[PDB]
């Protein structure tokens, strides 16, 4: 079990829900299908997004079985592993596909360094079993999972393949309506379920009542869902817990035939967090919300891949706690909060640094102290190149490490440390106003990175509540610029033949951005695999302009290849809005592709812009599977309507508030579980502990508000609660 | 028979 | 002149209204101004249940509170109704399918005439018949505790705190902060204009709506979005159980009279501070009521019998002429002594050079429109 799952079922265990799969029943010997339209065992839901990294990842090397052998292969698992996702959350309104697009290049410089390590790391342990076994098949590059690379072209088609036989076959996908939003459209996954989340809230007519769900392995999920500050929010996932006790009988391989799956319940968060982040004698009002942002902006700060940690704050998963009991007592002092809708208040951010970088020198101390004291357990139970530390030179435990730290890790004279120390801190403090932005409110600068390998220590954070904060949003690389900037010359086989004679040959403009062998720093990490690769900055100019000089080389397909694309919608002939878009989209006016239909939420649970398609859909047309295998039939277009997505501009900043008309939930959390996360109270069996747990999903009851003594209904309310209880 | 009766809305005679 | 009384305990047969259809609505500015198809003073819903724990004050700003409605030279003017009707006609044509054409306020007082004393419902009205349909219009007190202004105050400071003057989408986020020190104002208000009838009469109503619950829909009926926000002292005992059934009964007349399908109340306590707030459907406010209270159950389908006898009785005795070019009449309606009294307006009566040939009961514009018909 990971460490923040484990953190996650210690502190917060109601959350965590099993999720109810349906096996198909059985007569006569035939295997009946699933009926996807029968009421579900988990509950009712509208919005299910899907981060499709989250399914090819496992499809491609599965720790179940061994990986596919050819490409066809992994999509017909892709096939697989989408269908039971969707057979177990079966959304009922909407359905989003996030693949990876072209990040910022914030997030490219950790792929450019992920790609980097993976590349060598597993070269060198290649090359080790090839001499093994020459002295006495080739290994799928992960590398192919990137925008631009023909893979995921394949998987794009595979997918809209599958959407429309979804949605021309099965009879309960007739109200559904799926929106694919592949790697030719800019931007993550996660980052792309946000903002489709923030222009459905943005809708008048959205319903305040909406159940959404996310799919994804990654732990921000949990925050991203309470940033949508959505209550009736989910996040469906694989179950660590059943994992952990994998290791060892029959039903135990039955779980490694079947999965079980997780739910992660986003109200019953809430419900924790309402005591948790409970601070009194404030001197502005207490707002759920806004102390929900706070910590959300906390634990982007104790970790992200934006920005290198602090050396105080080791992992996430924990100093979270430091950071909260920090906010708990800094927040009386202050005027607001840390953060309004995705802004940072400088002054309380400044205040909080300060006091955090009061006790880092504690922290340190006591860091080394309990590592002595666990090389004591394990001891009674038993550069150019290479992996150098710099932190055994620095002893961050031993007092003068400020100076140690600098020289060691930055190699400047002392005499230069303090505007070195006040560019690092002003640059990682624009890092953190650009996460959250990045976070709350859409991508503040797609040029904008942190230009340093270290971050600076928690005393150095003073004197930027002046700064003033400002990102030019610029426009996304294209997917070969990305490509070229992420990827090493062990991977150039992806890009083109034209582009991969840049990341080699030794005169080539850009051959100092490439290197084949770079240090390592393990700044105090003892394991191997999250040691800092010190790989070299890409400039922006000289590369755009070493790439957009081949650009003109290229062929036709690859020209086509490298251009930006738009979300589709699918939907099915029996929709509520088939005949309008239809009738808008494919006339005879509308032929000319230049009239777009915005629709709202009422009608169909969902709002947007839609225009013709781009992919060449027409009406009594025939959709081909391009998956040579499987025997996949050929579809009808008379059964499918498809067309070109985009969302409706937010009118104004996205606040971070509770809609009007919002029915919470059946509460969760009894007063002990309460007065427990309140008051801090303390009291391998988690596994069985967590079967027993369900979560009502859904609005309960008619109104919004709560009963309250003082009220008619509430009056007769309480009196039928006093007569009940005698 | 008249009790019973709740005030109601009734569909009456419109212009589009 | 006619005369005619009629006894307030009699009981008609109709038991249902013709479904309330929105044909209009204008805007009242704070300088006595009407803006026909305006939407300015229309104002939106939001109240999140976590702001009832904020122990608002209700009495707060009492001193700044801005009262245009006293300063008004006409207070129950029907030029704004009168000029929405106009507008629709323009829009057909053809002149409006109506019998009589008043207030939703006139309305519900004649109505409550047949559960209330004179003293507390106060009923004088002034009924002219002009091109085959009667308008009504109500004269105002006229007359130009602490306690009292007090709590007409707290309605306007309620409403003032649980409404933006723009959807909640398109509100920043300073606005809905400092909402709850903006400045109350009366006077400036929404009106929408709805056609209804019950048995053979078909009425023109105007209602001044508070908010809009969900969402407007831009050119289309919007009477299942509104909403009607009051605001009355907590209930602690029996005896407020009943004094708030019997205010419940009133607010849902007013509602279903024009088809306000939401009612939301905020309860203050003894020290103006907003305790709750509970939201009822006009649907299921009669049923309640029998649950809880039968003798003001019953009243719900007495008050639509009585409502239909009263048009019954005011179409009868009050004789239309269908030429626009026809000699005018005024009536003047009051409830006293247990019954309504109807009785013409002579000419040596000062209120009848008014009434017939000047703008107190209609407009200049809405007359000569009506006539070049
Ligand atoms: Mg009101």
Redesign the interface.
């Given at each position: 079990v990971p460490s923040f799952f484990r953190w996650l079922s210690r502190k917060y265990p109601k959350i965590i829900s099993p999720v109810l799969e349906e096996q198909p029943q059985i007569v006569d010997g035939v295997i009946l299908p699933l009926d996807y339209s029968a009421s579900n065992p988990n509950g009712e839901l509208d919005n299910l997004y899907l981060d499709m990294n989250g399914i090819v990842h496992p499809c491609s090397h599965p720790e179940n079985k061994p990986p596919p052998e050819t490409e066809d292969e992994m999509l017909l698992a892709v096939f697989e592993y989408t269908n039971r996702v969707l057979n177990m959350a079966r959304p009922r309104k909407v359905l989003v596909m996030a693949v990876d697009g072209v990040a910022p290049r914030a997030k490219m410089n950790q792929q450019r360094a992920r790609r980097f390590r993976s590349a060598r790391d597993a070269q060198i342990e290649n090359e080790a079993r090839e001499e093994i076994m020459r002295q006495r098949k080739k290994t799928w590059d992960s590398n192919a999972i990137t925008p631009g690379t023909p893979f995921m072209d394949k998987l794009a088609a595979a997918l809209r393949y599958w959407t429309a036989f979804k949605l021309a076959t099965d009879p309960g996908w007739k109200n559904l309506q799926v929106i694919i939003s592949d790697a030719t459209v800019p931007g993550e996954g996660e980052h792309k379920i946000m903002n489709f989340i923030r222009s459905q809230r943005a809708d008048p007519e959205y319903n305040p009542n909406t159940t959404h769900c996310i799919y994804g392995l990654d732990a921000d999920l949990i925050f991203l869902g309470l940033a949508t500050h959505e209550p009736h929010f989910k996040i469906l996932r694989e179950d660590v817990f059943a994992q952990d006790n994998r290791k060892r009988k029959q039903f135990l391989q039955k779980q490694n035939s079947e999965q079980p799956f997780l739910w992660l319940h986003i109200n019953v968060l809430r419900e924790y967090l309402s005591a948790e982040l409970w601070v009194p004698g404030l001197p502005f009002t207490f707002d759920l919300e806004r102390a929900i942002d706070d910590w959300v902006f906390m634990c982007f700060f104790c970790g992200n891949d934006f920005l290198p940690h602090l050396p105080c704050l080791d992992v996430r998963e924990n100093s979270i706690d430091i950071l909260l009991d920090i906010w708990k007592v800094v927040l009386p002092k202050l005027k607001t909060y840390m953060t309004c809708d995705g802004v940072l208040n400088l002054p309380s951010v400044e205040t909080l640094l300060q006091h955090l970088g009061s006790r880092e020198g504690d922290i340190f101390k006591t860091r080394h102290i309990q590592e002595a004291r666990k090389k004591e357990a394990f001891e009674r139970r038993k550069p150019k190149n290479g992996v150098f530390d710099t932190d055994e030179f620095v002893k961050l435990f031993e007092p003068g490490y400020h100076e140690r730290y600098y020289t060691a890790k930055f190699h400047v004279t002392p005499q230069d440390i303090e505007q070195l120390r006040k560019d690092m801190v002003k640059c990682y403090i624009e890092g953190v106003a650009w996460v959250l932005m990045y976070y709350y409110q859409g991508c503040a600068s797609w040029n904008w990175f942190y230009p340093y390998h270290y971050a600076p220590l928690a005393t150095d954070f003073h004197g930027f509540s002046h700064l003033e904060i400002k990102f030019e949003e610029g426009t996304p690389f294209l997917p070969y610029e990305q490509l070229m900037s992420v990827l090493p010359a062990a991977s150039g086989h992806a890009l083109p033949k034209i582009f991969r004679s840049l990341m080699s040959e030794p005169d080539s403009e850009i051959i100092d951005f490439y290197p084949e062998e770079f240090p390592i720093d393990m700044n105090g990490k003892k394991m191997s695999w999250q040691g800092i690769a010190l790989l070299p900055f890409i400039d922006q100019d000289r590369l755009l302009t070493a790439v957009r000089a081949q650009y003109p080389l290229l062929s036709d397909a690859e020209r086509a290849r490298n251009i930006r694309g738009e979300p589709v919608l699918l939907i099915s002939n029996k929709n509520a809005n088939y005949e309008r878009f239809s009738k808008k989209l494919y006339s005879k006016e509308n032929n000319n592709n230049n009239v777009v239909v915005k629709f709202q939420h009422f009608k169909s649970g969902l709002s947007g812009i839609v225009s013709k398609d781009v992919e060449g859909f027409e009406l009594n047309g025939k959709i081909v599977c391009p998956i040579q295998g499987g025997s996949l039939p050929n579809l009808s277009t008379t059964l499918i309507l498809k067309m070109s997505y985009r969302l409706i501009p937010l009118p104004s900043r996205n606040k971070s508030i509770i809609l009007n008309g919002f029915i919470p939930s059946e509460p969760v959390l009894t007063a002990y579980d309460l007065d427990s996360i309140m008051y801090k109270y303390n009291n391998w069996n988690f596994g069985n502990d967590l079967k027993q747990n369900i979560v009502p999903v859904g609005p309960k009851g008619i109104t919004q508000y709560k009963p309250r003594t003082g009220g008619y209904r509430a009056f007769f309310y309480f009196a039928e609660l006093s007569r009940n209880n005698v | 028979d008249?009790?019973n009766?709740?005030?109601?809305?009734?569909?009456?005679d419109?212009?589009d | 002149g006619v005369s005619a009384n009629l006894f307030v305990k009699q009981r008609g047969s109709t038991?249902?209204?013709?479904?309330?259809?929105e044909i209009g609505f204008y805007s009242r500015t704070k300088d006595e101004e009407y803006l026909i198809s305006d939407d300015t003073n229309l104002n939106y819903y939001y109240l999140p249940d976590a702001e009832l724990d904020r122990k608002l004050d209700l009495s707060s700003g009492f001193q700044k509170f801005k009262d245009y409605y006293k300063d008004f030279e006409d207070r129950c003017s029907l030029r704004g109704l009168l000029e929405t009707i106009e507008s629709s006609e323009r829009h057909?044509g053809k002149k409006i399918?109506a019998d009589i054409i008043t207030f939703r306020g006139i309305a519900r007082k004649l109505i409550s005439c047949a559960f209330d004393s004179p003293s507390f419902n106060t009923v004088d009205l002034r009924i002219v018949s002009f091109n085959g349909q009667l308008f009504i219009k109500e004269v105002p007190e006229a007359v130009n505790n602490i306690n009292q202004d007090l709590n007409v105050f707290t309605g306007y400071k309620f409403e003032t705190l649980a409404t933006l003057s723009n959807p909640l989408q398109y509100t920043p986020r300073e606005v809905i902060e400092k909402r709850t020190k903006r400045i109350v104002s009366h006077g400036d208000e929404y009106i929408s204009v709805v056609r209804?009838?019950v048995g053979n009469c078909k009425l023109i109503l105007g209602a001044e709506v508070d908010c809009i619950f969900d969402f407007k829909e831009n050119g289309r009926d919007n009477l299942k979005h509104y909403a009607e926000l009051k605001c009355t002292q907590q209930v602690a005992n029996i005896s407020d159980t009943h004094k708030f059934e019997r205010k419940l009964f009133r607010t849902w007349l007013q509602c279903?009279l024009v088809?306000i399908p939401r009612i939301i109340y905020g309860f203050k306590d003894d020290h103006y501070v907003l305790k709750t707030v509970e939201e009822f459907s006009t649907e299921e406010v009669?049923?309640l009521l029998k649950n809880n209270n039968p003798q003001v159950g019953?009243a719900?389908?007495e008050?639509?019998k009585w409502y239909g006898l009263l048009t019954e009785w005011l179409l009868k005795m009050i004789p239309r002429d269908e030429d626009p070019h026809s000699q005018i009449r005024a009536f003047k309606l009051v409830f006293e002594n247990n019954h309504l009294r109807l009785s013409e307006i002579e000419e040596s009566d000062e209120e009848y050079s008014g009434l017939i040939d000047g703008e107190h009961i209609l407009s200049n514009g809405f007359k000569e429109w009506r006539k070049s018909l």
């Open positions: - | 008249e009790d009766i709740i005030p109601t809305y009734e569909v009456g419109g212009d | 038991t249902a209204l013709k479904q309330p259809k057909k399918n209804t009838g279903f088809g009669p049923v019953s719900c389908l008050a639509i």
